[PDB]
Design a protein around this ligand. Structure first.
Ligand SMILES: Nc1ncnc2c1ncn2[C@@H]1O[C@H](COP(=O)(O)OP(=O)(O)NP(=O)(O)O)[C@@H](O)[C@H]1O
Ligand SMILES: Nc1ncnc2c1ncn2[C@@H]1O[C@H](COP(=O)(O)OP(=O)(O)NP(=O)(O)O)[C@@H](O)[C@H]1O
Lengths: 407, 408
């Protein structure tokens, strides 16, 4: 019917969709092959088979539309895109392309994009590239964050506010609520800021972890799992960032939530041609390139990346990578095992967190309100400081917390 | 008679049987060669011979029913399955195929599957692939575990709750009691969860070590010894995992106790072609990470739970790297300590490094609280001190008696 609608129906539903057409051996095939079979045996209409995907142009000059639902995993139901199709519309990889597709002529392997209907949600005939847009401190225009889930989001707003175009590092040791934090920021971005494109990127992950996120986030959730190779981790990431750049080129605000930059860096280290502690010096280039991408764009739009830096893992290499990303970001949230050990579960190291150019993300009144909060929480130890914030915040909502705790 | 019955009888019995069918010199034959003789010679009463095993589809398109009791080692007495029989039934490598079998005609080499009776213990024409079932966090159902054997099983239930579909990692140094721990979970699972399919998979093992395990475990014990090739270590593990996946596609709970994923990993590393990192091909850790990756709790029912040892402290650079690359992959981990072992305290569990993710899903709020209180009182305690204090406090009664008889 409609490829993406196909790619988004449950496997059983797809199976009984196939059998209703007369397709026999479907149950023992990969979801993609089932989709192919259904798409192929629906070759009975005239102008009625629609496709879409993010474009990936391989070195040999031809391209492939790949699907977000598959986290851009090369598959049988990839819509092929011709060199002469990329060239007629100045298409570059990352381009989200929509339109009519068609079965393979015999000798052909893949379904083919027949006519280009839409590029990047715009007329195919229509943009200055990301790399020559201007980079402001993306501190103007704040991304703000009843219930107790909103307690995390309220400490953040005081500890380390986020703007459109931030390059944030979530510095997280094991079991400190790194994931719940991300789920929270996601949920908060969805309710509060539905105007942004939300991309959650999961790199070296556990399969079950993946589907947990896929079921919470209102946005694009893309993932490779630890049982795919470094090549794939790299691929998935590089596919995401480009998609993000094309969308900024259209003056959108795009927000990537990255689970481990550090795992991503692992991948590049194994994938790149031939050290400081396991990790090649040349390797970190593309990771940094990726993080470096974040920016508020003067010409309009922004790309914001919040990435977790996994810390305290007993890996020399994880450590080296973190060292190597100090100073790159312009926000940090620090998570602490001590605060986690005790079950006090916002779990932020207040005195170690904070974003740069706070003043641009904030009304003058607020900033001064924040400075006294900081003045008072400063000498408190990690654990105290959180316990003190939760008891005082839970009484109210963010704003009235200061009025109330003045006199 | 029936192929499985024939190959589950002692060799002397088989020679006796065989001699008394007119079959000369075979006392010095390999058992399987003997089995082959007894079949080929029992080809008198036609339509009696039944056969079975796990299917491995080879590159050319035909397959072989291979048998768990030789740890899926290719043999004269493997049942040839035709390309057409695979196509007729949607058959897949890992399938458990029963039926009737027929002797080789002039110019073949194998008994052949002539009639298919059961496939995966269901009707031969009756299931969606592991790879597209959904993967909940493996905590919507628990697998719990007054003797001193049960000491281990209890200590385990407070440190590292296993649930249907866990990817557990047993990190162990040498002589730290990992084999006996393995044996203890095995016994705790059979006795306690007979509904779960238990497969114990041993890689690169000493021969007598195999036999010992083969005789304690109520369930499938497949192994490959250090005398067999890396290829063979790879073969056995791949056959076991595939069978596992196949049973989950039938809504069953399979459990794989895997001994030395690092060994499994060493095997792939020698078998996998060409970028080195401490001895080990980066490329190489893919297939083991895959083996482990498969552990999941399936949404549409059934589960694949996997518990694997990672060897550590062997003074092999390679073993260390393997362990690192698995750091993070699991959702339970039980650490063993040489420390606690040297001092002969046997349920030698580093309780403070052990634990599983999403505990809350494997326990009742009452249980979790009790457990969280236990963790508060153990945290500042050293490695050796902590088990002595846990054993001498469990050496009173059973599990709930622990807390109802500690809350003084
Ligand atoms: N905001 C919260 N409120 C209550 N409990 C929480 C909160 N955040 C995390 N936890 C819990 O602490 C646990 C461990 O969290 P988890 O999501 O595993 O952290 P993590 O940093 O993702 N772990 P890791 O996989 O090592 O990175 C949980 O099981 C939680 O329930
Ligand atoms: N629960 C227990 N009760 C009594 N003895 C135990 C127990 N667990 C381990 N041991 C003993 O510790 C010994 C060696 O244990 P074993 O299970 O062989 O270690 P291992 O982990 O298999 N070593 P290796 O295979 O070289 O890594 C014994 O000989 C034991 O008796």
């Amino acid at each position: 019917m409609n490829l993406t609608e196909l790619k988004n129906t449950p496997v059983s539903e797809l199976i009984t969709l196939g059998e209703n057409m007369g397709l026999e051996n479907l149950a023992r095939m990969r979801k993609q092959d089932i989709i192919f079979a259904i798409l192929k045996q629906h070759a009975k209409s005239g102008e009625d088979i629609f496709g879409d995907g993010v474009l990936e142009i391989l070195q040999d000059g031809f391209g492939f539309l790949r699907s977000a639902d598959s986290s851009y995993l090369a598959g049988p139901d990839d819509i092929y895109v011709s060199p002469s199709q990329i060239r007629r519309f100045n298409l570059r990889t990352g381009d989200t392309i929509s339109g009519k597709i068609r079965p393979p002529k015999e000798g052909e392997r893949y379904f083919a994009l027949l006519k280009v209907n839409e590029v990047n949600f715009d007329k195919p005939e229509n943009n200055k590239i990301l790399f020559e847009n201007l980079t402001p401190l993306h501190a103007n225009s704040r991304l703000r964050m009843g219930s107790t889930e909103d307690l995390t989001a309220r400490v953040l707003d005081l500890a380390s506010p986020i703007g459109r175009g931030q390059r944030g590092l979530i510095v997280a040791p094991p079991k400190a609520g790194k994931t719940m934090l991300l789920q929270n920021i996601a949920q908060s971005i969805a309710y509060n800021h539905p105007d942004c494109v939300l991309m959650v990127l999961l790199i070296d992950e556990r399969p079950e972890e993946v589907t947990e996120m896929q079921r919470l986030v209102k946005g694009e959730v893309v993932a490779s799992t630890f049982d795919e190779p470094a090549s794939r981790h790299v691929q998935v990431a590089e596919m995401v960032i480009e998609k993000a750049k094309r969308l900024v080129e259209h003056k959108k605000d795009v927000i990537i939530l990255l689970d481990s930059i550090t795992r991503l860096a692992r991948a590049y280290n194994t994938v790149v041609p031939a050290l400081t502690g396991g990790v090649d010096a040349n390797a970190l280039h593309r990771p940094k390139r990726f993080f470096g991408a974040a920016r508020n764009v003067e010409e309009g739009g922004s790309l914001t990346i919040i990435a977790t830096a996994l810390i305290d893992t007993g890996s020399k290499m994880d450590e080296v990578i973190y060292e190597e990303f100090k100073g790159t970001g312009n926000m940090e949230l620090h998570l602490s095992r001590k605060i986690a050990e005790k079950r006090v579960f916002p779990a932020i190291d207040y005195n170690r967190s904070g974003t740069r150019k706070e003043e641009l993300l904030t009304t003058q009144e607020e900033l001064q309100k924040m400075w006294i909060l900081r003045k008072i929480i400063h000498p408190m130890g990690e654990i105290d400081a959180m316990e003190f914030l939760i008891n005082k915040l839970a009484m109210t909502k963010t704003n009235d917390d200061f009025f109330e705790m003045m006199k």
